[PDB]
Design a protein around this ligand. Sequence first.
Ligand SMILES: [Zn+2]
Ligand SMILES: [Zn+2]
Lengths: 76, 60, 147
Amino acid sequence: MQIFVKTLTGKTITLEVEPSDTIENVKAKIQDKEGIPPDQQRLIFAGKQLEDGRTLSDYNIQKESTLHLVLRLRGG
Amino acid sequence: QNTIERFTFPHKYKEKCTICLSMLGEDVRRLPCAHLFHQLCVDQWLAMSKKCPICRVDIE
Amino acid sequence: MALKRIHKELNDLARDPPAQSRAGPVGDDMFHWQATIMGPNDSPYQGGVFFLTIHFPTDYPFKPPKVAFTTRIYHPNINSNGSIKLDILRSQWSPALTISKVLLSISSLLSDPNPDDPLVPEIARIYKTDREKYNRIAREWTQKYAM
Ligand SMILES: [Zn+2]
Ligand SMILES: [Zn+2]
């Protein structure tokens, strides 16, 4: 299943995921493509910041959903 | 500027420019990441940072 | 250049309001704006109306706007002078960003503070160790200064 992760500047990341994937797994996948460590990623869907311990199904995230990636960097 | 021309593709357009926010015959420049901008708009940015304003990838 | 892009944003903000906010020029001066932003729903700032000032640099959009709260607010990432701890206002600015995206970002930060990189260390500490107290005080300050 494909989902899209968009950054504030309008970059689109496409990820191959499963509904059973946890937010933490999703962050890891984002890390492999974009080099951003999970700890400094925030993922938002439908206005809510997603929690690492929940799944995509938990938040009712479906095929070709768009998630927003917010970076909260160290020393920032 | 010469580094800009070496690693980018300048041409005439044939979608909005995210830098000036005007819609794209006008002179545009395509970065290696494939993002597109008005040549003037983007060159001003590249002159102070060698990274695409959208995907933040260095053009080198 | 800056002026042209700045009226462009004005229309785009009027037609498509970001996160229950209002924003426009201080009368004639296009490089100085006033904005209001509503406290996010089911945050402790809920119900509040918060004032922001915005100053655009002469070489906008290649340098970030200066954006600060002028309403007092209790938040780990916003200090007593209204400075806001957002990467995009400092080092992560890009000309592909817009004031709309900044206002969106401010709203997201109100909803979900980042206590690990604070502007107010002691409020961050409360947020971490006693969230009930953080919510209470945030609500109290909202009632006192923003409602
Ligand atoms: Zn342009
Ligand atoms: Zn790019």
